Design a protein around this ligand. Sequence first.
Ligand code: HEM
Ligand SMILES: [Ca+2]
Ligand SMILES: [Ca+2]
Length: 319
Amino acid sequence: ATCDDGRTTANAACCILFPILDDIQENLFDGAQCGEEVHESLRLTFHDAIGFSPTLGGGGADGSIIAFDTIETNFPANAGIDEIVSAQKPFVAKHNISAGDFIQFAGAVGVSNCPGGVRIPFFLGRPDAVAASPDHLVPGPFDSVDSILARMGDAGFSPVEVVWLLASHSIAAADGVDPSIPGTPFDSTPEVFDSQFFIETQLKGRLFPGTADNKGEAQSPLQGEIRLQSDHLLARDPQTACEWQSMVNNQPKIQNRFAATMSKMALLGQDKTKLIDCSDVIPTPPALVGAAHLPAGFSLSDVEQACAATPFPALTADP
Ligand code: HEM
Ligand SMILES: [Ca+2]
Ligand SMILES: [Ca+2]
């Protein structure tokens, strides 16, 4: 099909996304940048979708975190999410798509602005949300590995899928974990969707980048990075450490698994066969240029190797 302005897409119903795409790129992502608004919109896709529990309810990726923001933004795990909900609400009011489609569309378009990124499959047609998420369904950084895996498993993700979705922390920073140092990233390349997050969480911790006593924070290996305790533990737990290390210097696997697992997450509470595939509307992301590395000056002796089956790969660092 050819839309009214000449852009093409496989299914005609997808044409309504083009003006939305142009508005988001200009007015939500500040001229299609891979910056904080993209990182915030990707976090929002997960805080919207993971409100899904077979025993308690919630409609998953349904827009409830916007539609019922008065409730869901009161949950402590949603602290800080109100800013991006407020930013997106007027786009949903202006355009003619549901809040659940909007949140997944904006996260997929955002990720396409990041070098190394992928086009997350995107389906159009989710109905408006009909219930708020139950409380207590979003994992937090002070939760044990067993607790996070049980919650993600309950929503339908295996432990290796947890690891694959946490590639999102390659384009991520924290404002709440240590409020003295807002905007401190989880890896050294928060505008590049790469394997640095999986490498740098494996380093021995050295210091706290801000204050020392924050709940859910581990020591970081570098002054300009922050480390969640949940990431510290998942990189070292026998349930997940082998998969974590397998992502290092493995950009094809990061891309293939993040796209597929993001799509499964974007579809929680929905049925793909009732929606319209509009994947080809998402922009084509830039590719990576630089190789994966340890931080300069670090060596394999600074890595806490946690996979008994396979040694950590011998990457270069300091030239
Ligand atoms: C599985 C357990 C997870 C835990 C415990 C967790 C925890 C957190 C925490 C504590 C923050 C920082 C919030 C702040 O203080 O500002 C954060 C940020 C973020 N999270 Fe995760 N997360 C998890 C999974 C995910 C998943 C599956 C996604 C996929 C979309 C995601 C995407 C993000 C993004 C992109 C940010 C950066 C937000 C920004 O820079 O503005 N997280 N996460
Ligand atoms: Ca939801
Ligand atoms: Ca990165």
